[model samples]
Target chain A: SAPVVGIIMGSQSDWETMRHADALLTELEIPHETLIVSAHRTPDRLADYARTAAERGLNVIIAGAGGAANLPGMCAAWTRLPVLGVPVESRALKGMDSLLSIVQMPGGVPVGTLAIGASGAKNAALLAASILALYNPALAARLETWRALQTASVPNSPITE
Target chain B: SAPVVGIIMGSQSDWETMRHADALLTELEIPHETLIVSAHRTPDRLADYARTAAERGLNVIIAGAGGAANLPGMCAAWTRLPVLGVPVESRALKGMDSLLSIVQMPGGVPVGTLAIGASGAKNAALLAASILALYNPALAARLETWRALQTASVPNSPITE
Candidate 1:
């Protein structure tokens, strides 16, 4: 199927976290594609993927990785489409290096950064949906309902025994 | 009992997350204190607390906050001891601002930052334990067993229903 959103990560290990974004997008009925496009190991692959994303009809790109993560920033460097970064937790620094590497980008190229790990991946998908909803009436309605339900579903207080 | 680690946060709102750090430290029999010390609203309180930490018998400081989190960095500025930062997830940017504010410390001082939210809080306590264990033989033995149990507990593959 053709995709409006592109979810890219550095490696197979990232799928454990990035797959949450995939699941969210699927639940929203948003057409999208997920793939492993490393900014370090496969620089050329990332370059081309980002460069051609717009022509391929991608409205937004979600790039996620850990340890000196440059995938999101580099993805934005090659494309004008909105790019969101999710810092996957690292073995040592626990994504501190990844978060800093992505969030502290200079003025020109801005990558919308999210929290580290699964929370970030889910939010990325939700934010991407919000952006796409601007031109999509059906999606706009669905997203609104999603937001409303999320808010309403929360309990007033925590349970304590 | 006297505390070796001090867990400080900006407000009571942070307790829901910082409590994980407190609980972990307790689980490992690591004496630590948890309190509200705002870096912005009550700057003097943070300055006084941090400056007195080492002499107060506090070996490590775990500071957590959301929205322009300066608690950890400013705390580090006053203390010679190690400072661990946990970026509590913010409602707006989801701790991106908090993460950036804490992790990007200038040349002189350093903040050992962790992942956003509860995971960060949990890891902060764990990291503090590792640092303390360098000089504490009994704690070192306990942590080794904890690490061994953790590694042994991991499943080789995911369980899909």
Candidate 2:
């Protein structure tokens, strides 16, 4: 089946963060693909991947990168398809740099940015699924079911460490 | 008098968020300077500003930028001085991008990153003061006093709207 979502990252190191998205997509039974596409080091590859993403049967693209993380914004620039950005944590400043770079797109281009690290990656998958669910009723139902389970899992009282 | 701290942003638009830092620094009685330094559009200015920062008698740098926020990292790269990053809230992704771009740095370079938007901006000032306090006992006393006031300001319980 053609992939509905495309997950790309700046480096293989980002797999640690991007895998959260992959896991969620798998749990949701969403067809997706993951690959490395560095913006600074491999601009050509990023351009090619983003430019042809829509034609490759992808409805949503999630780009994860850390430090000068321009992958998401650059992807948004090349493709009309909705791009979700996840900021992978770096050693020094953590994920703040990645988060800022990915989220702050100038007017015209847009990339729905999520939180840093795992939470953001997981949310990106869910958001992508939500966007896809607009067209797939089965997906919409599954997503709602997932949301209900999540809400039920929250405890009424905070747990003591 | 020589400014001990430098608070710079990418554009005038950033002043809205960066002003929080300015206000806090002012409240702490920290002499500082603020200016525009766009990393993408004004690379030359950034290089010159960063390289000559220490020579100009600046102790700490607080740089705020939204969208492709290379200002902080670029500044860190140019000089040995400590750099603090404030991720200004953006129009689309709400500063997540700004946060990531400012925070993440490879091994060797460092940019102490704060939270996103106004809170981060305020914290940047506090963090800068903390760093400065290491050398200046008077400033350290003022910081402690400010911290005490802040702690007292917090309410015991959440207010019902």
Point to the candidate with the largest TM-score.
1
lDDT of 2 by residue, B45-154 (tens): 78998999999999999999886688999999998999999888865457877888888888899999999888999999999999989998998999999999989999
The C-alpha stretches of model 1 lying farther than 4 A from their native spots are A1-161
Chain B, model 1, TM-score against the native? 0.97
Error of 2 at A95 (Å): 21
Candidate 1: clashing pairs of residues: none
**After TM-score superposition, what is the CA distance of residue A103 in candidate 2 from its true location, in Å?**
16
TM values, all candidates: 0.55, 0.52
Docking quality of model 1: it rates as incorrect
Alpha carbon lDDT at A58, candidate 1: 96
Index of the highest-lDDT prediction: 1
Task: Evaluate model 2: give its lDDT.
Answer: 0.87
The 10 consecutive residues of candidate 1 chain B with the worst lDDT sum are: B152-161
